């Protein structure tokens, strides 16, 4: 057993001028409903702002790729659908391995729009970052971003852009098995 994927979000990615494919993230709505709602709403852009047009501004091989700065765009910005920030919902899910999706923050209770996809098992972040999703398709796209040349700020030299985002309804929820759940 494990928690159920109840929704999905897609990001179509372009690196410079090349379309590199689509990342599909499955979301654990029953585990972290409030966090999932924020991420889905930002993906669809229904509130009038969202992930479309944002980039993965910080990429560190074998650690994570980070994105979702939907205001300033340099990695210092972002906002949630609930306000500037919202509290940490819970820490039920861990960064179990590669491809788990989690909220970036600026300390306790400062979730906004920015998120990251793991490229390792960062156990030191367990209990500090809210985990809410899992990459179910497009791990090759994540790897393409991961291998991008970056500067000394870990920013890709060429922009890795989310050119479209949205949701895909899940008609049949499915379990992502988790050891010892």
């Amino acid at each position: 057993r494990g928690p159920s994927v109840t929704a999905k979000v897609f990001f179509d990615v372009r690196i410079g001028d090349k379309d590199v494919g689509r990342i599909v993230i499955g979301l654990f709505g029953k585990v972290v409903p409030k966090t999932v709602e924020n991420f889905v709403a930002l993906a669809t852009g229904e509130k009038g702002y969202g992930y479309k047009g944002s980039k993965f501004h910080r990429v560190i091989k074998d650690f994570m790729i980070q994105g979702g700065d939907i205001t300033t765009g340099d990695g210092t910005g972002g906002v949630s659908i609930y306000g500037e920030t919202f509290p940490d919902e819970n820490f039920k899910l861990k960064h179990y391995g590669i491809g788990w999706v989690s909220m970036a923050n600026a300390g306790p209770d400062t979730n906004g729009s920015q998120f990251f996809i793991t490229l390792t098992k960062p156990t030191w972040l367990d209990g500090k970052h809210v985990v809410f999703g899992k990459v179910i398709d497009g791990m090759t796209v994540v790897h393409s971003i991961e291998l991008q040349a970056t500067d000394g700020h870990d920013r890709p030299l060429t922009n890795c852009s989310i050119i479209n985002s949205g949701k895909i309804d899940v008609k049949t929820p499915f379990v992502v098995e988790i050891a010892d759940w």
């Binding site: 994570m64 700065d69 970036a104 600026a106 960062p122």
Partner: peptide, 11 residues
């Protein structure tokens, strides 16, 4: 270090 922050990016 290896953190994921929004504003002050640290070691």
């Amino acid at each position: 270090x290896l953190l994921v922050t929004a504003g002050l990016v640290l070691a």
